[PDB]
């Protein structure tokens, strides 16, 4: 399956490389009490906007974490950057975390729109479900995941309330 | 198929975003004489080193192109960087280009090594072939590709000679 490959791609070329160095990057930034995990937004509708504040105005960009750099596949100093968001609830800052959407969900979205990609617009939801299921299975038994990462899967609503529910569990 | 999804992912979340802005970045750097296309290395063995000079000492890093920046899926100022290499032939600089390996080939490589990933070590070569075939089909009919991109697919040997052969065609 394409979803299965994308979930494996997402772990191999991203999660596996950034999750081990994430603690040191948040500690560096702290030294506005940002949480220690990467919160990954997984909309099952594959609706992935580039600006989180457009999805919910109660999610507001605060700052970027110090950039991660690595030589990768002929690219000298490839950059991995993560953004810090503050979550508002009735005019109050209720949480602060490293938040982003899972980017492969934009591939599933674009593949369902292009005729030569071979999967209908109808198939988007089950591909998104298989992607979340594969990613949860990978992170269940992955070493780089040590209470380091949280997946927020959802079907449409308040996005900031959805994130806060997961944040309040810790 | 996994390869098919990875080729679509490679075009949607990368080629489609960097190919239209590539000319303007090479022109800026040229203000030597770097070629106008992105040369994409596609080893069918999925052998993707992080340093190009280790694959062939006749391929030597020169400089980075001005970074490309975009807000993407909740990541403010996500960075896309490309490296400029010089190709040597008997102690002479024979070519200068923006060169890199296709990164999904590291996913196919890692998936053939992990038991929960679904395809064996045996399947690596045909997945790499399907990936190249899908990517060639995508770039045949893609608008962003306007004598902008060159795929260098190969089975093992001199890598710099393989790149120079493609460079000398233009
Ligand atoms: N050569 C190269 N240079 C790049 O800068 C780059 N950026 C993406 N890609 C490849 O394009 C395709 C589409 O990208 P997508 O965002 O959907 O997936 C990405 C994305 O979900 C995540 N990821 C990797 N690097 C970053 C990053 N810097 N910021 C956010 N997410 C990232 O992990 C997936 C796999 O990454 P790569 O394994 O490097 O391969 C991707 C993929 O094949 C790149 N390929």
UniProtKB/Swiss-Prot annotation, chains A, B:
Task: Name positions with the PTM Phosphoserine.
Answer: 81
Q: Which residues bind 2',3'-cUAMP?
A: 14, 78, 103
Q: What is the protein's species of origin?
A: Homo sapiens
- Output this protein's name: Stimulator of interferon genes protein
> Binding positions for 2',3'-cGAMP?
9, 14, 78, 103
Q: What else is known?
A: The cGAS-STING signaling pathway drives sterile inflammation leading to type I interferon immunopathology in severe COVID-19 disease caused by SARS-CoV-2 virus infection. Tissue damages in the lung and skin lesions are caused by activation of the cGAS-STING signaling leading to aberrant inflammation. Endothelial cell damage is also caused by activation of the cGAS-STING pathway: SARS-CoV-2 infection triggers mitochondrial DNA release into the cytosol.
How does it associate, per the subunit comment?
Homotetramer; in presence of cyclic nucleotide (c-di-GMP or cGAMP), forms tetramers and higher-order oligomers through side-by-side packing. Interacts (when phosphorylated) with IRF3; following activation and phosphorylation on the pLxIS motif by TBK1, recruits IRF3. Interacts with RIGI, MAVS and SSR2. Interacts with RNF5 and TRIM56. Interacts with TBK1; when homodimer, leading to subsequent production of IFN-beta.
Q: Which residues carry this modification: Phosphothreonine?
A: 69
Q: What does this protein do?
A: Facilitator of innate immune signaling that acts as a sensor of cytosolic DNA from bacteria and viruses and promotes the production of type I interferon (IFN-alpha and IFN-beta). Innate immune response is triggered in response to non-CpG double-stranded DNA from viruses and bacteria delivered to the cytoplasm. Acts by binding cyclic dinucleotides: recognizes and binds cyclic di-GMP (c-di-GMP), a second messenger produced by bacteria, cyclic UMP-AMP (2',3'-cUAMP), and cyclic GMP-AMP (cGAMP), a messenger produced by CGAS in response to DNA virus in the cytosol.
- Specify the effect of residue 13 to S: Slight decrease in c-di-GMP-binding
State the family named in the UniProt similarity comment for this chain: Belongs to the STING family.
Name the residues that bind 3',3'-c-di-GMP. Answer: 9, 14, 78-81, 103
């Amino acid at each position: 399956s394409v979803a299965h490959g994308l979930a494996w791609s997402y772990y191999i070329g991203y999660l596996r490389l950034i999750l081990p160095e994430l603690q040191a990057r948040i500690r560096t930034y702290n030294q506005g009490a940002v949480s220690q995990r990467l919160y990954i937004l997984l909309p099952l509708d594959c609706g992935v906007p580039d600006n989180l504040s457009m999805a919910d105005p109660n999610i507001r960009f605060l700052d970027k974490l110090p950039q991660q750099t690595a030589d990768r596949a002929g690219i000298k100093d490839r950059v991995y950057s993560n953004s810090i968001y503050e979550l508002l609830e009735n005019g109050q800052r209720a949480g602060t975390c490293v938040l982003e959407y899972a980017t492969p969900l934009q591939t599933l979205f674009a593949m369902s729109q292009y005729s030569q990609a071979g999967f209908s617009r109808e198939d988007r939801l089950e591909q998104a479900k298989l992607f979340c299921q594969t990613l949860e299975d990978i992170l269940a038994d992955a070493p780089e995941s040590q209470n380091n990462c949280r997946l927020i899967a959802y079907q449409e609503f308040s996005l900031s309330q959805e994130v806060l529910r997961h944040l309040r569990q810790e």
